[PDB]
Write a protein that binds this ligand. Structure first.
Ligand SMILES: CCCCCCCCCCCCCCCCCC(=O)O
Ligand SMILES: CCCCCCCCCCCCCCCCCC(=O)O
Ligand SMILES: N[C@@H](CCC(=O)N[C@@H](CS)C(=O)NCC(=O)O)C(=O)O
Ligand SMILES: N[C@@H](CCC(=O)N[C@@H](CS)C(=O)NCC(=O)O)C(=O)O
Ligand SMILES: [Cl-]
Ligand SMILES: [Cl-]
Ligand SMILES: [Cl-]
Ligand SMILES: [Cl-]
Ligand SMILES: [K+]
Ligand SMILES: [K+]
Ligand SMILES: [K+]
Ligand SMILES: [K+]
Ligand SMILES: [K+]
Ligand SMILES: [K+]
Ligand SMILES: [K+]
Ligand SMILES: [K+]
Lengths: 48, 244, 243, 271, 49, 48, 271, 243, 48
């Protein structure tokens, strides 16, 4: 996959000149998948 | 002692499940690539459902129909797991699941007398393709428990040299020396598990390289028998039974 | 801009070059490496495995029969059974073996060779044969007495069905060319010698037994064997695109 | 588990001096090929040897050294300024035969593209033109013409170069959905079909196609292209019996039967 | 001048390449990043909806 | 032969971009040459 | 073992001041060439000398400095878009004569290839074309035509460049099966043959051939090629008597007998 | 991409350049270096070895006879025996010597020279000769008296058959050109002088003995000798490709 | 003459790729000039 021996040195003044970002993580999708006020546990019924 | 003097005893006993196989003229036991069958590691697995592990109901010896070493005999082969796809609970588990993984213990038997001469190459080949024909016949790629006769032994049915088949796990049944061959085979594939009705991981071939000859008047009817046992098996993706 | 001076070779495409280059899929993450039996790291592991020699390469022998060395009850003594140049990469009985194929993928070789023979007659069939290796200098030995002066082993048929004759590495140089092509390169210079087999006593059998039997011949590289300079295997070719 | 270890060496084995042996105990020469094991008789046991500190290396036969060089995998000319090449290594036998020496293998690849302009009579021209090579994964739309919209290539990777520049070159990772590419597959491409045409081919080995065009239309001439591939970071499993018959088809290993591999000689007793 | 040897691939335009290049406006200073709800970092967050 | 003063620095993000591996060792061929259960010493007879 | 040491110096020897000598003891001038030894009389012993701190170096006469530069070894034109050159340095005398100054030598080499397109009248053309140089080791199949399958070069090393790019260049290691190349061999190429044609040539010096082609067909023109070789990391043994007669053959050192090397003068007493 | 600026010289092929370049066989491992006698690291080791001067280069002398300096019983005194320019790289008697060949591979030289002479007459043949080195400025000396004013050695024939005349390095500059070509370069400027030999007494022999004898002349570089600027040896040439 | 500030860094795997050797010394020529068993001093007569 990705290298653990990558050399990141910027040759230019402006950050716009830099190469692509190398993070690429993902985050908990809750803000999109479960944007509700009241927590609804997986083991219980949703509405009661 | 056998292990003390540094040699291999000619007798052997193979016990799996409710079956026991014995031989008094063996020639050691081969363990393919030096690896015994093993279960799928959590770091190699991909299918998420809890697998089925039938144990003794499927991991036992199944004897297939015998084959005659005729004068014109060119050899015979069997595909695995194809050959056992309809035998016992191993076959049932293979049919009811999408995925299968397992190893094997193969025991080839052929006895004659000290008045006979002949030599059989017993080889287990991974991914052995029967490609001597433009469009291979299903009857030959998946011959079932009866197995299929060789038509092109010299080219190993795949365009390679028979003499180089020794690069695969094998033994020989040289009548003056032994009457059986035993091979333990681990699961081999580029995947952690696969379909037992669409892919045959191993092919067992029994090929006469030195024709059967004997003192005039001796028994002429000499059968070759194959006994195979699935070992360390597991299945995933349960559903209704499906055969190829 | 850092001052630079580009040199000869710039822009060339050397098939054996070894540079780093941009990836088509920079963030791609491959499937995990799983546990698969039989990993090989060097093909020397393969040439050390014995394979059959197509030793009986004569008009009368077709297919499988070409692997069998004919042996029969004699009515004369000291007779010859077979002969062969030991060179692993030349055209002949060795070319279709594992050792031969890989040797043919290289230009030079070195190391001892393992020639193993298995007797396949009946349990009652006995005999003693002598297998000899004749280092280079002259032609193959004409009789058993001459052959016997070189490296050899006397084989007695019995419970242990096989015997090994080690053709030790005996060469002026550390390596030998894999071909003996003469017309252009005069490589006959590298001939490694011959291996011959003779009846030490005789093949003897009981009444009504087969008076002919077979010997299978295997060959493999020893642990001190190596190859150098990769080259295309002369056996693989084509006359047009494949469809 | 694994009952046989695999210790690594960087040089071949040395030879140790040995002396004569007259005994009934040790019998190194006696073997039994029936066991399936290769002889274990050593030089030192068969003859009297001297000491040889052998420093010969083993590097050139490593998988990396054997496979680590470029070989031709594709060669074609555009037609109407375009050409569609399905990625597979069965067209040209040299590299094909090499790969088939292993059953399974993982490796990255370096592709190198050499292109020139040729006329109708197939005579090379000194003409610099821009060309585009686009990788179209299975499922993506393949351009029908030299100017179709797919050439926008906003997602498909593309490489644009010129016949006047050095050969184009890019690396590709191990892309199979499997954990290794398979160079021998005894199975079918799908369930419910047992026709010979779908036997012996593992679909996961086919990653798509390369479609090529000249960015603008050539006048009466065509673009000639050669694609070379070089395996890198090779890991291999299960050595196979080498091909011993000519290849006949690009997608199958079908062959013509033969009764001999090497040529015949007068007699078995004359070397 | 430091001796160099240019290699295959030189001058090519690989759409997925990732090099540093001179900026058209080297001293430009972008507007600040403000607080906007719903930031997404990976589309896996979307297919899970 | 090979150098003892080689500079290995990766300029790219993905390992696929890296140059060829530089190990090149060989391993004991036993798993292929002698894949048997019972050890058979060179000095003794194979079968007894 | 070695009874005569070989201490290294980086500058020539200094001169030390000396004075007159009137004695019956020391007689530096008296010598005896019959012993096979070169005179050991020093400047300081033959005349009165002054002190001279001599800092003159010895670098330009080292084997590396003497051999470390490129020289032409091959020059040819394609025919039918192809040419087969057997690798050997006997065609062009300059480099050949240099190498023959040593009996044995080990060295790596840097090969440089300069190619241009010329027409039938041998007039150079400003035409950029791709060409391929493939190294075919002995035993490998040599391509018969410009488009034969061997050009796939999946194992044979090949270098593909363009007449529009700088000269191609690659290094090769010390490849002989021997422990040194031999530039003088008093023996035969094989056992059982004593014909003159197989005398004086050591086969291990021949590593194969270079076959060249233009990747695509030229129209009426040919590819002109020059190959230069430059020894590197030279190690040499046993200096030889320099060639003193013209070379006549590419593979043998045959020559025309002569009764003098330098030209004559009127008399031995007039310099 | 790191900003760079390529400079003049880019792409040129300088035969004496010294860059690193990709190897055709990156993983190749050469045969071991074995123990071979006579290793040479610098050709200065070779020019210090004495070799024969083709001193008698006249019409009447063919082949081997050209190495012999004629000596004979005189009937007059102070006569001359031979003369020669000492310059090691010019056309003449020195050009075919070891020293001469290598000097001809270079453009400049420096250092003292060793001229050794061996008398080859009978054990009973006696004589004394004077060998002189005349530093530049004028023409070669016309008589023994003039020659005797320069550097010289008086040689007495006896048990020790040889004598050495060291031509010390006496030059205005640290180096001299190896050619004296005048028409174009006016290099006659570098002439190093002359070496001449004269009868000091006379060659004397017993009754019926050979009244003529020979002297062999050897030359070699001294330990303070060096060469600069490699150039192609003018003696090696060809008119067409060799076959 | 030669530099005392030369940068020697190998970029390639095989030593054959390296630039020319930079030693260039000369050695005592005795093995060629005076390969005799018995030492013959410059001050004495060669044979006696
Ligand atoms: C955009 C630049 C184009 C460069 C080419 C990229 C090609 C990507 C595909 C790589 C897949 C390689 C798989 C090799 C296995 C095939 C084996 C077989 O033929 O059976
Ligand atoms: C693929 C690029 C091609 C570059 C050329 C590679 C050439 C490889 C061969 C090198 C062998 C050199 C041996 C020199 C000794 C020959 C002496 C002789 O002529 O007798
Ligand atoms: N078919 C177009 C002409 C071709 C064209 O402009 N194609 C565009 C839009 S369909 C494109 O995507 N071109 C990609 C390219 O050529 O790079 C027309 O309507 O005349
Ligand atoms: N002879 C071929 C034409 C030439 C050709 O396509 N050759 C192929 C396969 S034989 C090749 O290997 N070419 C190598 C190359 O030219 O790079 C035909 O049948 O028309
Ligand atoms: Cl041959
Ligand atoms: Cl031959
Ligand atoms: Cl001159
Ligand atoms: Cl002159
Ligand atoms: K719930
Ligand atoms: K269970
Ligand atoms: K070792
Ligand atoms: K044994
Ligand atoms: K062995
Ligand atoms: K000094
Ligand atoms: K002396
Ligand atoms: K001297």
């Amino acid at each position: 996959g990705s290298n653990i021996h990558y050399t990141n040195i910027n040759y230019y003044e402006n950050a716009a000149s830099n190469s692509l970002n190398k993070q690429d993580f993902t985050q908990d999708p809750e803000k999109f998948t479960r944007p509700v006020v009241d927590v609804m546990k997986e083991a219980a019924v949703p509405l009661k | 002692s056998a292990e003390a003097c540094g040699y291999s005893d000619r007798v052997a006993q193979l016990t799996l499940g409710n079956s026991t196989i014995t031989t008094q003229e063996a020639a050691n036991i081969v363990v393919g690539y030096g690896r015994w069958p093993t279960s799928l590691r959590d770091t190699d697995a991909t299918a998420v459902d809890k697998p089925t592990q039938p144990g003794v109901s499927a991991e036992r010896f199944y004897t297939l129909p015998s084959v005659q070493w005729t004068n014109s005999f060119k050899g015979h082969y069997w595909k695995l797991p194809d050959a056992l796809s309809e035998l016992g609970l191993f076959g049932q588990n293979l049919q009811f699941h999408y995925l299968y993984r397992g190893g094997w213990v193969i025991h080839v038997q052929c006895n004659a007398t000290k008045f006979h001469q002949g030599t059989l190459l017993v080889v287990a080949t991974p991914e052995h393709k029967i490609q001597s024909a433009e469009s291979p016949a299903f009857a030959r790629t998946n011959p079932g428990e009866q197995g299929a006769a060789y038509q092109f032994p010299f080219t190993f049915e795949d365009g390679t040299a028979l003499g180089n088949a020794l690069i695969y796990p094998h033994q020989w049944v040289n009548l003056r020396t032994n009457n059986s061959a035993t091979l333990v085979l681990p699961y081999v594939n580029a995947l952690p598990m696969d379909s037992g009705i669409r892919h045959n991981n191993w092919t067992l071939s029994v090929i006469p390289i030195v024709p059967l000859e004997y003192a005039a008047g001796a028994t002429t009817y000499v059968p070759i028998t194959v006994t195979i046992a699935p070992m360390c098996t597991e299945y995933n993706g349960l559903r209704a039974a499906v055969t190829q | 801009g850092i001052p630079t001076l580009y040199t000869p070779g710039s822009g060339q495409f050397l098939t054996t070059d070894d540079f780093q280059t941009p990836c088509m899929l920079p963030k791609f993450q491959p499937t995990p490496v799983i546990d698969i039996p039989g990993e090989v790291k060097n093909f020397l592991e393969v040439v050390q495995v014995e394979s059959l020699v197509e030793i009986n390469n004569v008009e009368s022998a077709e297919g499988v029969a070409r692997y069998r060395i004919p042996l029969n009850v004699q009515d004369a003594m000291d007779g010859q059974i077979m002969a062969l140049r030991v060179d692993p990469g030349i055209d002949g009985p060795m070319q279709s073996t594992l050792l031969g194929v890989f040797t043919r993928y290289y230009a030079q070789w070195s190391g001892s060779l393992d020639f193993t023979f298995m007797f396949c007659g009946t349990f009652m069939t006995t005999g003693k044969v002598i297998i000899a290796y004749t280092p280079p200098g002259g032609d193959q030995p004409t009789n058993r007495r001459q052959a016997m002066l070189g490296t050899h082993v006397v084989w007695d048929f019995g419970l242990q069905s096989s015997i090994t004759l080690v053709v030790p590495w005996i060469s002026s140089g550390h390596f030998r060319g894999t071909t003996l092509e003469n017309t252009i390169y005069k490589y006959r210079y590298y001939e490694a010698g011959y291996i011959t087999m003779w009846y030490q006593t005789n093949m003897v059998v009981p009444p009504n037994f087969p008076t002919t039997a077979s010997i299978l011949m295997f060959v493999a590289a020893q642990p001190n064997f190596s190859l150098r300079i990769l080259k295309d295997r002369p056996d693989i070719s084509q006359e047009g695109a494949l469809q | 588990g694994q009952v046989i270890k695999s210790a690594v060496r960087s040089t071949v084995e040395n030879t140790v001096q040995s002396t004569h042996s007259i005994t009934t105990e040790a019998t190194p020469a006696l073997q039994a090929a029936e066991t399936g094991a290769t002889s274990n008789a050593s030089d030192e046991s068969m003859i009297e040897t001297r000491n040889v500190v052998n420093t010969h290396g083993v590097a050139e036969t490593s998988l990396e050294a054997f496979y680590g060089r470029a070989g031709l995998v594709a060669m074609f000319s555009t037609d109407g300024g375009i050409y569609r090449w399905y990625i597979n290594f069965g067209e040209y036998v040299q590299l094909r035969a090499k790969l088939e020496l292993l059953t399974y293998a993982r490796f990255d690849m370096e592709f190198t593209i050499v292109a020139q302009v040729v006329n109708a009579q197939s005579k090379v021209q000194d003409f610099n033109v821009d060309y585009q090579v686009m990788f179209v994964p299975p499922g993506a739309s393949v351009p029908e013409n030299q100017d179709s919209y797919q050439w926008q290539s906003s997602c498909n990777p593309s490489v644009i170069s010129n016949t006047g520049l050095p050969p184009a070159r890019v690396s590709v990772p191990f892309m199979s959905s499997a954990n290794a590419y398979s160079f021998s597959y005894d199975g079918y491409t799908q369930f419910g079909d047992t026709s010979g045409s779908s036997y012996g081919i593992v679909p996961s080995n086919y990653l798509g196609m390369l479609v090529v065009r000249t960015c603008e239309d050539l006048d009466g001439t065509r673009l000639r292209v050669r694609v070379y591939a070089k395996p890198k970071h090779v890991k291999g499993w299960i050595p196979r019996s080498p091909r011993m018959t000519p290849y006949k088809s690009r997608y199958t290993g079908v062959y013509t039967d033969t009764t001999k591999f090497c040529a015949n000689r007068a007699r078995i007793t004359t070397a």
